[PDB]
Amino acid sequence: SLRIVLVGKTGSGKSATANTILGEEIFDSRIAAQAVTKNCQKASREWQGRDLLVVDTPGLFDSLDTTCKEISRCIISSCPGPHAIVLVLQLGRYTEEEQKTVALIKAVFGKSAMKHMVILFTRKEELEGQSFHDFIADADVGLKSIVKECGNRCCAFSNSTSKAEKESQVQELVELIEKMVQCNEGAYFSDDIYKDTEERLKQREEVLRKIYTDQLNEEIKLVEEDKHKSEEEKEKEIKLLKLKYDEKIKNIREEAERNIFKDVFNRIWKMLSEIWHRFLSKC
Ligand SMILES: Nc1nc2c(ncn2[C@@H]2O[C@H](COP(=O)(O)OP(=O)(O)NP(=O)(O)O)[C@@H](O)[C@H]2O)c(=O)[nH]1
Ligand SMILES: [Mg+2]
């Protein structure tokens, strides 16, 4: 299993990138004068060997409230921790919004997060006769710097362009991610946040297990000691109940993720309120 999070500016091609990872178009990718993704979204894909889990995020910079909301959502979805945090840029310069984005990940998740960051570019088809190598070779101090921090993990993507090319890019991305993780002591990203937020997640899931079971064992109890009902009626009812139960265990993960939101939000809000002086737009 691979947990990857796509963060970046608005319009950078995050959703497109997600689509090309997922093999089909799930998320909304189009050209806009607005944010097309207003909400953290997640999906899964059957791959050669693994289940790929892709977290698409709203464009980081456009609100302390909103930023805190979406980050928190991102954290919950990415639990227990992400394998790769992919910073998505349009081809060319490393710009101020990406600078602040990188600053944010650093600030909230520590500097220790930069081992799991990979840089991904979109519009690969736009460079034409120039090599991507040649491309990153002409780069600037800031781009070179962040590439260095990220361990020289860089990709270019063409979302348009055949499936076989696209899936090959997927091979590149996934492989490098596995390389990175292996060199990273073979585990996902784990933070003070992630540990706590996961513990909460586990606690509430076990709780809901206590709830749903005690609900089903009760509904069953009525049917057993109920008279005037045929045994076939008892059996048909209980069978349906058990079906609804097995459907309701499938539900716990999504329902659990919803319960902790405000708690993690508050925790992040405590932290982030002080810090926001760094991410204001001056002027
Ligand atoms: N040529 C080309 N265009 C691309 C590529 N990736 C994205 N685009 C273009 O960039 C536009 C923005 O796509 P989108 O995925 O919506 O960006 P986004 O990151 O989702 N924006 P947001 O995060 O606000 O929803 C699309 O209309 C698409 O045509 C790429 O690899 N090549
Ligand atoms: Mg989007």
Swiss-Prot record:
GO CC terms, sorted: endoplasmic reticulum; Golgi apparatus; lipid droplet
Region listing for G3, in residue ranges: 56-59
Tissue: Most abundantly expressed in spleen, lymph nodes, and fetal kidney, but also present in the heart and the small intestine. Lower expression levels are found in lung, kidney, liver, and thyroid, salivary, and mammary glands. Also detected in the thymus. Detected in T-cells.
One GO-annotated biological process of the protein: GTP metabolic process
Region G2: start-end pairs: 35-39
Location(s) in or outside the cell: Lipid droplet; Cytoplasm; Endoplasmic reticulum; Golgi apparatus
Cross-referenced Pfam families: AIG1 (PF04548)
Record GO terms (molecular function): GTP binding; GTPase activity; identical protein binding; protein homodimerization activity
UniProt cross-references to SUPFAM superfamilies, sorted A to Z: P-loop containing nucleoside triphosphate hydrolases (SSF52540)
Binding residue positions for GTP: 10-16, 30, 123-125, 159
Presence of the UniProt keyword RNA-binding in the record: no
Annotated spans, G5: 158-160
UniProt xrefs under InterPro entries: G_AIG1 (IPR006703), GIMA/IAN/Toc (IPR045058), P-loop_NTPase (IPR027417)
Record carries keyword GTP-binding: yes
Region of interest (G4), residue spans: 122-125
Region spans: G1: 8-15
Consequence recorded when altering residue 126 to W: Impairs dimerization and abolishes GTPase activity. No effect on GTP binding
Keywords for the protein's UniProt record, in alphabetical order: Cytoplasm, Endoplasmic reticulum, Golgi apparatus, GTP-binding, Lipid droplet, Nucleotide-binding
Similarity comment text for this entry: Belongs to the TRAFAC class TrmE-Era-EngA-EngB-Septin-like GTPase superfamily. AIG1/Toc34/Toc159-like paraseptin GTPase family. IAN subfamily.
Subunit structure: Monomer in the presence of bound GDP and in the absence of bound nucleotide. Homodimer in the presence of bound GTP. Heterodimer with GIMAP2.
Function text: The dimer has GTPase activity; the active site contains residues from both subunits.
Protein name: GTPase IMAP family member 7
Organism expressing this protein natively: Homo sapiens (Human)
